[PDB]
Design an enzyme around this catalytic site. Structure first.
Site, mmCIF file in Angstrom:
data_model
loop_
_atom_site.group_PDB
_atom_site.id
_atom_site.type_symbol
_atom_site.label_atom_id
_atom_site.label_comp_id
_atom_site.label_asym_id
_atom_site.label_seq_id
_atom_site.Cartn_x
_atom_site.Cartn_y
_atom_site.Cartn_z
ATOM 1 N N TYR A 53 0.647 -1.427 0.163
ATOM 2 C CA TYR A 53 -0.343 -0.104 -0.007
ATOM 3 C C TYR A 53 0.605 0.980 0.253
ATOM 4 O O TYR A 53 1.971 1.316 0.389
ATOM 5 C CB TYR A 53 -1.173 -0.643 0.803
ATOM 6 C CG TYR A 53 -1.668 0.477 0.683
ATOM 7 C CD1 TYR A 53 -3.195 0.447 0.517
ATOM 8 C CD2 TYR A 53 -2.531 1.726 1.940
ATOM 9 C CE1 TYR A 53 -4.464 1.658 0.043
ATOM 10 C CE2 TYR A 53 -3.210 3.055 1.715
ATOM 11 C CZ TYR A 53 -4.004 2.248 0.543
ATOM 12 O OH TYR A 53 -5.026 3.338 0.645
ATOM 13 N N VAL A 155 -17.697 1.122 -3.404
ATOM 14 C CA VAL A 155 -17.381 2.286 -4.000
ATOM 15 C C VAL A 155 -18.719 2.358 -5.269
ATOM 16 O O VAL A 155 -19.238 3.372 -5.860
ATOM 17 C CB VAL A 155 -16.024 2.563 -4.814
ATOM 18 C CG1 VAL A 155 -16.051 3.828 -6.241
ATOM 19 C CG2 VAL A 155 -15.218 2.908 -3.461
ATOM 20 N N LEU A 271 -7.773 8.509 -2.419
ATOM 21 C CA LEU A 271 -8.484 9.167 -1.305
ATOM 22 C C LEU A 271 -7.817 9.655 -0.926
ATOM 23 O O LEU A 271 -7.789 10.778 -0.458
ATOM 24 C CB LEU A 271 -9.525 8.771 -0.983
ATOM 25 C CG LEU A 271 -10.432 8.984 0.018
ATOM 26 C CD1 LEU A 271 -10.941 10.369 -0.943
ATOM 27 C CD2 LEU A 271 -11.621 8.689 0.382
#
Lengths: 332, 332
Positions: A53, A155, A271
């Site tokens: 990540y 989403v 985000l």
């Protein structure tokens, strides 16, 4: 006592994540004490635990990035928050999988408490991503269309509602599943105009299905590979395909001819980046905008399964599933 | 006699293209007569004959999209061109592989006659593509770095010079070849700051080679595949990789993590489209700006092999080769 889900190594969550007790700190000034209400388990949480990540909290870290907490107390100089207030993290990396914490007041942002808890617990991520992706890339006007894949995701589902409440037409690609017919009706009642299979799209009858309605200038991708290649094919000259998810081994493929002669664009959306690039207040308006849709029943939380912190392993496992039926929500 | 290189069917140039005698038209009004001076053989010409191009002239067509010519005579109402004037094409599609032709005045653009004819024959394409890619995607300042692949190509070579005249720093990726050492010294003398192989780039020592100098916000792609993914890897957060060519079966590959956590952008560039989307005056400005670099010896013609229109197959053959030593230029 204070119980937290923490991982000291990076690996498969069900192995890495273990339940631990922790001592609380002191509310030393700008600090804020919170009681966690509900924390979902999301893919970004899993990737983080796995070590794959863009942002990796130092080990040992507390799992989770999203969730609602109720203020229990404030530091000597806290202005915006009084106990009983509902808070969510200002940015990713916080560690929500724990009964209680003491957080700096700037790592938090107040949310209205007149919304369903389940909505508040899942508002900071999926609906924000959905909204931003609809806003930040192509200027869409009512009647304009948007094509997306993984339309049954947190989403995609949120994109369907928001799009609908926006006066937009969504053509949603869903994975092949035993009963793709059950899903269809579901999303269609969410506002979805079209629901198609990864299959129905890669047939020859696509160059024409998309004939009556306006081609989309925006494509939302979370799968990659051939699914992503097909999304690119549905785009109008100059459209943008924004990738916001997928596998680390399932890269996005762009035809040389689509980039040159159709002038398509390919971008990404993160985000956490937007939240870090913008002011707390800016994140605040976005929330206000999303609470608006909620209050007027245009945006609703998705299938929730509340699991006590005690049984996180089962929840954790259930989230590692590609066909996970409902969002696992840790409660304490 | 008016000789031309025409193709009645799409396919391998060395097969479809054949020398044909043609009847010249009448200088009816705004028409302009010209004697072709020299016409390069570009990849876009090949893709055109082959059939894999975004703009295909109707068969039977004359090959060629670039070249210099002298005005022989003008039409009843021609304002800007007097015979003896040097011209190049205003946009692609004209059909330059012939001895003589009559073109509408708008399809042409005067070139100063004080530049070399050799330069003038390759000015309307490659140097234009290079200068536009340096300008239209990222705003580069002196000291900024740029990365490209196929640095020894016509475009790549023009990039080196223009980038140099622009005060930029180039890191140029060349394909592996028997003596990559000869090539390197050549480009280095054109202004290239670094010349590197496809091989040297995909090692591990890259995450650090780019450590001293600044990361590039701009990457220029012509290959695709793993080479295009490695170019992608060298970009700074928010950088753009522009694709201006490649194989129809060698698409561009974008890693999910690179688009998302690095916010990389992928675009295309098509000179023909920019020329159609823009005014003649805007094309004239570009031409004047490029002619200025030449005038000052900052932009020089690339290596070429001049070949009488007679032996076109020879030149055609030479250019369908991946390791072609020099630009094949047709003379008439």
């Amino acid at each position: 006592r204070v119980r937290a889900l923490v991982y000291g190594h990076h690996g498969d969550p069900a192995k890495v994540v273990e339940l631990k007790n922790l001592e609380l700190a002191a509310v030393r000034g700008s600090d804020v004490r919170v009681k966690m209400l509900a924390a979902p388990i999301n893919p970004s949480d899993i990737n983080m635990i796995q070590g794959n990540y863009g942002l990796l909290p130092e080990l040992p870290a507390v799992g989770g990035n999203e969730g609602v907490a109720q203020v229990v107390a404030v530091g000597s100089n806290v202005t915006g928050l009084k106990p009983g207030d509902w808070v969510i993290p200002a940015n990713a990396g916080l560690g929500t999988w724990r009964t209680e914490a003491v957080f700096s007041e700037e790592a938090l942002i107040q949310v209205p408490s007149d919304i369903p808890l389940q909505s508040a617990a899942t508002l900071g991520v999926n609906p924000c991503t959905a909204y931003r992706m609809l806003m930040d890339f192509e200027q869409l006007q009512p009647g304009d269309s948007v094509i997306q894949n993984a339309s049954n995701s947190g989403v995609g589902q949120a994109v369907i509602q928001i799009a609908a409440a926006l006066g937009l037409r969504t053509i949603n690609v869903v994975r092949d599943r035993p009963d793709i017919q059950k899903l269809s009706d579901r999303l269609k009642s969410l506002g979805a105009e079209h629901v198609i299979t990864e299959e129905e799209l890669r047939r020859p009858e696509m160059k024409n299905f998309f004939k009556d309605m306006p081609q989309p200038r925006l494509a939302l991708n979370c799968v990659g590979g051939k699914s992503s290649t097909e999304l690119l094919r549905q785009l109008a000259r100059g459209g943008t395909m924004v990738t916001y998810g997928g596998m680390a081994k399932q890269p996005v493929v762009a035809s040389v001819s689509l980039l040159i002669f159709k002038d398509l664009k390919l971008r990404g959306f993160w985000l956490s980046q937007w939240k870090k690039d913008h002011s707390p207040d800016q994140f605040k308006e976005l929330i206000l905008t999303l609470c608006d849709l909620i209050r007027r029943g245009q945006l609703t939380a998705p299938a929730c399964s509340q699991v006590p912190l005690q049984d996180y392993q089962s929840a954790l496992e259930a989230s590692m599933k590609p066909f996970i039926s409902s969002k696992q929500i840790l409660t304490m």
